[PDB]
Write a protein that binds this ligand. Structure first.
Ligand SMILES: COc1cccc(CN(CCN(CC(=O)O)Cc2ccccc2SC)CC(=O)O)c1O
Ligand SMILES: [Fe+3]
Length: 498
């Protein structure tokens, strides 16, 4: 067993290098490795591996007082030296962390003693503590497990301070975690967690029905949503649906014809019946999104005007811009050119395909010819990084990334958002203001800058917001209520109490 559970994940957890990305899975890195400060649902951080901290008047020098009772799972001590060596290991690979502005802000990290850790920054970077709280990269592996005094070229054993220890991994089969019996904090009620590798959502549903697994936990792609709805009525099962955690949208390429035209992007934003899309493809399980960030997101309650479903207005906008229908044709033309837009998505993702088909149908109704380009994952991500798309499915990152970290990353040219925004005359101003907002401690100016950035992105119709999506749970009733974590990408296994 009653203190052992079996769940599933589409892939293995990876080698659990705390400082690297794909194929490491963030929820699993968070099971084993811990931060200096821990993120809370109210947006603050609490003391964690660091007991307390102070900062200089200019806000550029921070000194953390560390706990002195923490051991890595292999018995070796956690101290300021171990922490400092981890920061070094991360920043020796600084280029790979460009998306995260703290990695560009840290100028020095040194252990002043066994318990005092000093971090110095380029500027007064306000999201400092929240980015220290992220699943990666600033969490701590035992320095003995460095390879050649680094982590960027690999690690030995994935030894953390966290409440879970990786027991064993079997590529394409399973991963097994066990409770850390020597954890500095509270002991998890669960003793053992087995992750079965099950890449297909239908197969995951079937695995639950047969009793092969005890728990499914994930976002809107966890299992088929019609099946989820059926499960929620099944008295043998338990299901949960969280409050929304992030946005799913479309990103429109402002630097590529015909989405380079504001009038076209505005029309597309009137063309989609989002409520119908959600009820049709998402089985009514998610919420309609009118803006890049939901009004509940910090700094994003701005009274931005929604573009409600209005095919008539969409047509009028296109007509006014010179996109008119030839005799006998349903696809508009201008200057000889047809109104043709390519929508790229992961071809094997049934949900994405379903939504893409609905979007194509809705846009054909207003005279736009959307071509569906379904491709493998690697090809879609390549398209995102180099801007080879007309429209592309995209999503925000949830707490604590939204909005500051998502906005920060809009400045990175190898990200979808930069590419989508590249055609805007105001793009340099936007990027300047993003840099400014991260470093201001004038709260009035900070809100003003967020308003200007988000309002320009909204008014320029860079995105086509679709849904605010939720976390979803399917479980054996004996496991009880399943909690959600403050960080959207983490799974609070240590909080489960049968
Ligand atoms: C569930 O995945 C995410 C949930 C919340 C935020 C992000 C954004 N990631 C941003 C950085 N990634 C790129 C991206 O998701 O666009 C990973 C990354 C960083 C540096 C170089 C490569 C890559 S992916 C090969 C954070 C992370 O992966 O730690 C997520 O990828
Ligand atoms: Fe990522």
């Amino acid at each position: 067993a009653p203190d052992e559970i079996t769940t599933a994940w589409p892939v293995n957890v990876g080698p659990l290098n705390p400082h690297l990305y794909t194929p490491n899975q963030m929820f699993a890195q968070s099971m084993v490795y811990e931060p200096l400060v821990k993120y809370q649902a109210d947006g603050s951080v609490i003391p964690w591996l660091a007991k307390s901290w102070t900062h200089s008047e200019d806000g550029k020098t921070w000194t953390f007082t560390l706990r002195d009772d923490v051991k890595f799972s292999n018995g070796e001590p956690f101290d300021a030296e171990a922490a400092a060596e981890n920061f070094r290991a991360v920043l020796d690979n600084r280029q790979r962390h460009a998306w995260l502005e703290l990695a560009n802000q840290i100028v020095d990290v040194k252990a002043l003693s066994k318990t005092e850790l000093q971090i110095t920054l380029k500027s007064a970077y306000y999201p400092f503590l929240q980015e220290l709280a992220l699943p990666r990269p600033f969490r701590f592996i035992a320095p003995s497990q460095f390879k050649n005094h680094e982590t960027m070229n690999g690690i030995k054993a994935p030894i953390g301070t966290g409440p879970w220890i990786l027991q064993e991994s079997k590529l394409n089969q399973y991963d097994v975690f066990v409770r850390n019996e020597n954890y500095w904090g509270e002991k998890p009620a669960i003793k053992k967690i087995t992750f079965n590798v099950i890449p297909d959502p239908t197969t995951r549903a079937v695995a639950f029905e047969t009793g092969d697994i005890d728990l499914l936990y994930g976002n809107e792609g966890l299992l088929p949503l019609d099946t989820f709805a059926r499960f929620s009525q099944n008295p043998a099962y338990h299901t949960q649906l969280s409050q929304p955690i992030e946005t799913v949208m479309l990103a429109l390429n402002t630097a590529k014809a015909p989405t380079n035209e504001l009038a076209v992007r505005e029309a597309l934003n009137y063309a989609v019946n989002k409520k119908s899309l959600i009820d049709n493809a998402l089985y009514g399980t998610q919420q309609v999104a009118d803006t890049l960030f939901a009004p509940s997101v910090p700094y994003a309650n701005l009274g931005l005007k929604p573009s409600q479903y209005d095919p008539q207005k969409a047509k009028a906008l296109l007509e006014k811009a010179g996109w008119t229908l030839p005799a006998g044709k349903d696809i508009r033309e201008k200057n000889g050119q047809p109104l043709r837009i390519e929508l790229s998505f992961i071809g094997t993702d049934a949900l994405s395909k379903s939504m893409a088909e609905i979007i194509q149908a809705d846009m054909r109704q207003i005279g736009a010819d959307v071509s569906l380009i379904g491709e493998e994952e690697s090809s879609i991500y390549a398209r995102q990084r180099d801007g080879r798309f007309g429209m592309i499915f995209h999503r925000t990152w949830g707490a604590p990334y939204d909005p500051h970290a998502f906005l920060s990353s809009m400045r990175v040219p190898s990200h979808a958002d930069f590419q989508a925004q590249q055609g805007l005359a105001d793009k340099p101003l936007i990027d300047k203001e993003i840099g400014e907002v991260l470093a201001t401690h004038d709260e009035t100016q900070r809100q003003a800058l967020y308003r200007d950035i988000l309002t320009r992105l909204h008014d320029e119709a860079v995105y086509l917001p679709i849904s605010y999506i939720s976390m979803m749970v399917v479980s054996k009733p004996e496991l009880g209520n399943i909690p959600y974590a403050p960080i959207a990408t983490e799974i609070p296994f240590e909080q489960i109490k049968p």
